[PDB]
């Protein structure tokens, strides 16, 4: 039996078994400080509704604060397929403040980009279950939605924010709630009569520590490897026909940056990163005589057909010199998330990393744009010459061309994710460096 | 001899099997006590 | 007088789990 | 140009990342391990194998350490496409591990289904079904060889392998009880399938064989293993019909430090059904057609993700008269707790609340010591079962606080907790350290 | 109340969990790393690129370490959706890695198919499919730019990144023999597609540039990298259509510490076809209609999960005449081993037996060193291929020991061994420590 | 085992004592050192006419 | 095979057409090993 | 209608005298045991 | 287990002393009332200690 | 097996081979008597 | 529809100058090639016979 493999022991094993350091059949678990975790609701300061801005202040119920989920109760105004990520669509702007200093800020489109890049597998399906109606629910369906926040302290206990160490500083979140949410109170630009206003609550889990560790948090100075998001929007240069437009985006990023991600979108339809086309799932009524390529079949807004995407190529240049040689758009949709994340990315969302493990939190390579005078992202667009209404042309052409309906992707969103250092001492906090 | 022993097909020297007793020994007992009652355990003496 | 796999040496315990014997009747 | 353009662009803000570095990970040094071999050896089953029968298998001591154990069944399907739902683990009604006469753990068929639905995810879960169900629309009379891997504390973690070489004095064995009825194989609903074949079982154990010095060390030294246990006592639900919002207060009889509290609600007749049945495509037999009925599921699609068909409205855990956390709605336990802790997708009807940061992990990360709590109660508030299950207009478009009239069939309440204990191996004798 | 009612519920049975604590989960200190930058640049392809052509790429010393390598292809297909099946990697039929005149590895398209069908799992594999195929139902004339990553020892993790900085006098080369036929591009089965365009190829290599302090140590000091190799030779087998259950002893020729043996049975005329074809959905072209023809696959769905279309009934490995483990049925190697060792789903017809606890990782976890074994044999038992592939009643309604008549075409046997070696680097010279 | 007589259908007992019919103690279960003693009862299916 | 005139009347190097069914090749070897028994433990001296 | 076989395995035991049992229990033994080695294979029988 | 078959049990050390061993059977009638006479004892043909 | 270690492994056709080779005269005939139906027994014959 | 392969293991034992080999039809002494209907390769090659 297996003894025969032990007998077949040779010189090549000097590197594998010689003077053993570990064994796989005797694991030793490390003992951990006593703690308890509790789910506590925070109170929302302000009137909740479409287009309103509200805030919340963190109650110091415990020693550290870690995982914040914002809950929405929505009534859909349409039938199945008329909605697409309505919970995070409503959750338009989330601003993180610690002690009077702005620390971070996330947007609904970032939540969709993050879901498009970094959250993967069953976890991404479950995310969609928390943010959408995925079981073909019909008009009038009422559902409770959960949009977990993804700040630096939200996904790993190791970066939990030590409120006991911040007794003199206020921790707040500001929430901008979108005026137009697709399939809930508007269908495209048309208002849905009788749409209900949202109900919102914010739940967060607290960490309670025993005497010795809470004392250490309260009295000792700490540094946390805080991550931040940087964002400003710009317009696209999408051509119509016979030309591939060039565009040079002057970037306004700084700090040691892990990666740059961007998308091309239709600002009217949340999550539309591709052109509409008369192929299955690519537009309303696709495949039938009622098909139209001006309105998506919203619930299937996200696709993987990159021929509906408008990036023919991209190059990043630093201080007048190229950072890498020009790649076609499918490289940033298919290869970089493959090398770095090991997931999928829908068409129209692109990622280039400086980090080898950007999904991780321990540093794995950065580009520090605090020391770079000129950071420019050069884009080449695909020619938008294909008739979107003819599937023979949509599914039968070359890589440098796309649908004529691509000219609707008028907004460009470039996100940068980077490192900073969060300092906490004697009850107060702030950043070590801000640019 | 046309060949030297290649070292292939070697043997384990004096390999013993698994030490297994035929006694099915008494299940080892717990170190702590069965927990009882924290509020009124062991009974409360009632006066006459 | 015993091969190693036979048992862990009994020491530092006193549950009185096992008997002493001559092993022959 | 290139990467050199950012390496030279070095400054103060880089020191926290690259100044006085501790590691370079482009030169990974791998740790030298102990020589071992893995072998699969067949066990002999004691007792007649059959529906409704109990058999036992004592593990033959051919190797040093035990890791996985896989139960092999040969089944013949008595129905056609979509008539079965994980029949291999339904058949495996329960298993328990006994070390020298002391039982350590007890798993039940609906636990295996819960575990698969709650902790196993992605391609792994699909492959698990491949091993336990018929997934390519196979027809009546088809024969398939099924594998049900066991999930005790040592089966999926090599680091906790059962040290047989160090149990010189104790028998190690598993008891197997096989279900009397398996949907689509022996019974179709509650009606017997004439001519159904009796599945054949074989139990296989994967052995680890150690080299010279390590085998000596395992045999002669005492061991302290941190192990997992499943705690379970079943109960009954209080699912209302119309106008009443039911609430139960189930005092838990759990002991010891645990990782989590998990539960589901079951239809005792339809194994694996944790939600109501409604005339929704894929939810019931004939769903969407004039032949549709909401009394019989489309068994191959018994599990769903539509929480609208769920029976639980809200819940909380209370300890000693005081709330453990604030009341949360039923959808919180189905989707958010596993998101925050497991990283998978949990289907409708399965609910989880963790006490641990990584309840799916082997490394302890938080707990709940039930032996030190006077009264741990799980409060379950139910949805009003007023939707007419036969009308998609009402099933796919109603409020959050109502469920289908057919939810009243989920009469069994299954509350589980997963423990910590310590397995002591001393002078060839094994037993657990803590009683209760 | 809440978290504190839990926190104080502390006892003796917590001494092995929270007593004398060693770690805290809520403050992580992150390690500082040697500063580096990554670039993706083009290499020069030496030779004419096209169908059946042989070209090579020499990796220019543009940097210090080499990590991933991605080969680009541009193809235009002559077929509609479903006529292609990983055409980007079918073309990449043989990639040979040379360092210092010595062959380090050789991968075949069939291996890329086995790796993707075995170790790449979940969302990562869906992406791979879109990297190597036409997925979103593209039609005749559609052009696609493809990315085929290489999976040599230094391609997936920086930990074994290849130090050109330390190979000053040895060149590193990749040889690319390209297939003469790619399904759906220049052939549809055996039928040539008139007007098919030649592929265009570009090879991109990822360079790491290190800071000055560590890269000096790289250039001057010796290194020992513990790296993976692939060993391969193909064979031929046969399975009768009736009355006999065939057996065949396959004679293996492998050396060095081995992580695993994986294999398949291929129809050489259709890349990746490891199972029988049948008139059931997705199992042949036209399946379910009068045009169904079981001699030609519905290519885009060539991979299946239906074990009854596979040809292997059982297999055993014998080493020097000794049974390495007791005979297991074919579904063990298709489903239970990847469940235990990988955690994903292996399509039918692809088989794995591991020697390692975690063959998907790079930390050595158990090996079989074939350097002391004179004759290793893989004993194969085959299914009777008597079912008429065109009759679903028998294809999906039969016993485990019989498969369809089209299984007799799975005549090519491809056994892969994944091994260890050590790549030594010193004074600008590279080479493998053990040569076999 | 515990008393030696005949118990009619529908009456059930489980004894901790060796011979509970007697007066002298012969083995007891101390319910003041037990948190809960829970009796689990599985019913027969009421299908016979 | 059905014609005794050939089966009982042919030469050394010729046999019946029915011999082609003897397709299973079974080769056995018998060897020594040593069973060593000490203080209750036993095993093969030359194990595989 | 073929019936399942009924099997019963019988083993012949040797009971020795007290003095020899003592020697067997206390003393080391080496037995020059015999083994059987076997794998199955296939032969190529010719036609004509 | 079956008619005319032999079985055995090797009794483990769950406890300190054995006080009572009871063998039990699940049997079905092959006939109506009055056709049996202590069939459990007829079945338990030989018990060897 | 002894102690979980495989000492020997026999097959049906080895038993036949051993009878074919090493059993000889009345021991082979008696072996047959202990293994087959040798008196032209008819359908239904039961033999131990 | 197939390309065969073999791994023919050798059992040779001395300083060797060369390995030489062929494939043959055991029926026809010296036939190391396939037969075909071309001049000199078959009986009657080139004709209807």
Short mmCIF file of N, CA, C and O in Angstrom, two decimals, chain E residues 316 318 323, chain J residues 6 9 11:
data_model
loop_
_atom_site.label_atom_id
_atom_site.label_comp_id
_atom_site.label_asym_id
_atom_site.label_seq_id
_atom_site.Cartn_x
_atom_site.Cartn_y
_atom_site.Cartn_z
N UNK E 316 -6.31 1.58 -10.97
CA UNK E 316 -5.42 1.34 -9.84
C UNK E 316 -4.01 1.70 -10.28
O UNK E 316 -3.66 1.57 -11.46
N UNK E 318 -0.08 0.67 -9.44
CA UNK E 318 0.81 -0.32 -8.85
C UNK E 318 2.23 0.18 -8.96
O UNK E 318 2.64 0.64 -10.03
N UNK E 323 0.30 -2.96 -4.88
CA UNK E 323 -0.89 -2.16 -5.07
C UNK E 323 -0.60 -0.90 -4.27
O UNK E 323 -0.23 -1.00 -3.09
N UNK J 6 -0.24 -6.23 5.08
CA UNK J 6 -0.54 -7.35 4.20
C UNK J 6 0.64 -8.30 4.09
O UNK J 6 1.74 -7.92 3.67
N UNK J 9 -1.67 -12.55 -0.32
CA UNK J 9 -2.88 -12.31 -1.11
C UNK J 9 -3.05 -13.44 -2.11
O UNK J 9 -2.19 -13.61 -2.99
N UNK J 11 -5.57 -15.59 -5.01
CA UNK J 11 -6.68 -15.62 -5.94
C UNK J 11 -7.13 -17.04 -6.30
O UNK J 11 -6.35 -18.00 -6.35
#
